[PDB]
Amino acid sequence: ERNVKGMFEVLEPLHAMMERGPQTLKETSFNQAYGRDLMEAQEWCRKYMKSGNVKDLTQAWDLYYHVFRRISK
Amino acid sequence: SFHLLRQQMSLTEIMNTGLQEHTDDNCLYCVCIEILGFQPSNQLSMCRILLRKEVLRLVINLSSSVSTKCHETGLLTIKEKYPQTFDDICLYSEVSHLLSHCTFRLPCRRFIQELFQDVQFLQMHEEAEAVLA
Ligand SMILES: [Zn+2]
C-alpha cells in the first residue's frame, strides 16, 4: 500500500514497549540478541521521518528483514 | 517523485538530469574539468535521462534485500535491451557513491559492480591523453 505512516503506527508501540527495559530472562535474552539492530533500524526510521528520502528507509527495512528472518527460523 | 509514479505506470509505456546528488565533486569525471582543464561531457544519444533514474531506483530498491531477484531481472533486462546506458561515467559515479553510503549485501554489491565491468569509458581516457601531452 506504500503507507509509511501506517507501518510507523504498526511498529512504534513495539519500540515503545522495548524501551522500558526487559523484566524477565526471556526478554533480556531477546534484548541481548536483537536489540542493537532494533535500535539502529529505529534510528534510520527517525532519520527518514525527519528528512524524507528512501535512502534512509531502505537500510532500516534491511535491518528489519534481517531481524524477521532470524526470528522466523 | 519518480518512485511514486513508477508504481502505477510501467517501463514500456513511459517511453512513448536523472541523478539526485550529482555535483562537480564526488564524480569520477566532473572533478577534473576545473582542476585539469578536462573537456565537458558529451551529449549522449530525455530518451536516456529516464533510464538513468530507472536504473538508479532499481539499485536503491536492491539495497533493502527484500526481493532482490526481481530487481536482478529488471536490471539485466535494462542491460540486455540498452547496453549503452551503462557507459556514462557520471552514472557509475553516483551508483558507487550510493554503494558508499548504504547497506548492500555482498552478492548484491558484486552484481552491481559486475554490471559496470564491460565498459569502455573512451572520452575520459582520451581527455587524459589530451591533457597528458
Ligand atoms: Zn559527473
List keywords for this structure.
part of a larger assembly; 2 chains; A: 73 residues; mainly alpha; 3 helices; 82% helix; globular; B: 133 residues; 8 helices; binds zinc ion; transferase
Structural write-up:
This is part of a larger assembly, with chains A (73 residues) and B (133 residues). Chain A is mainly α and 73 residues long. Chain A has helices at residues 4-18, 25-50, 54-72. Chain B is 55% helix and 0% strand. Chain B is globular and about 50 Å long. Chains A and B meet through helix 3 of A and loops of B. The structure holds zinc ion. Residues 22, 27, 29-30, 90, 93 of chain B line the site of zinc ion. Chain A: It comes from Homo sapiens.
Produce the secondary structure layout.
This is part of a larger assembly, with chains A (73 residues) and B (133 residues).
Chain A: H1 4-18, H2 25-50, H3 54-72
Helix pairs in contact in A: 2-3
Chain B: H1 2-5, H2 11-15, H3 32-36, H4 49-61, H5 68-81, H6 89-99, H7 106-115, H8 122-132
Helix pairs in contact in B: 4-5, 4-6
The complex binds zinc ion.
Organism (chain A): Homo sapiens (Human)
Family (chain A): Belongs to the PI3/PI4-kinase family.
Subcellular location (chain A): Lysosome membrane; Endoplasmic reticulum membrane; Golgi apparatus membrane; Cell membrane
In a nutshell, what does this entry contain?
Chain A is mainly α. Chain A has 3 helices and no strands.
Shape of chain B: globular
Compute the number of strand runs of chain B.
0
- Please identify the oligomeric state: part of a larger assembly
Order of helices and strands of chain B: HHHHHHHH
β-strand amount of chain A:
under 5%
Work out the helicity level of chain B.
40-55%
Number of helical elements of chain A: 3
Total beta strands of chain A: 0
Largest sheet of chain A: none
Bound molecules: zinc ion
Quickly give the structural class of chain A.
Answer: mainly alpha
Binding site for Zn(2+) (chain B): 22, 27, 30, 90
Family (chain B): Belongs to the RICTOR family.
Protein name (chain B): Rapamycin-insensitive companion of mTOR
Subcellular location (chain B): Cell membrane; Endoplasmic reticulum membrane; Lysosome membrane
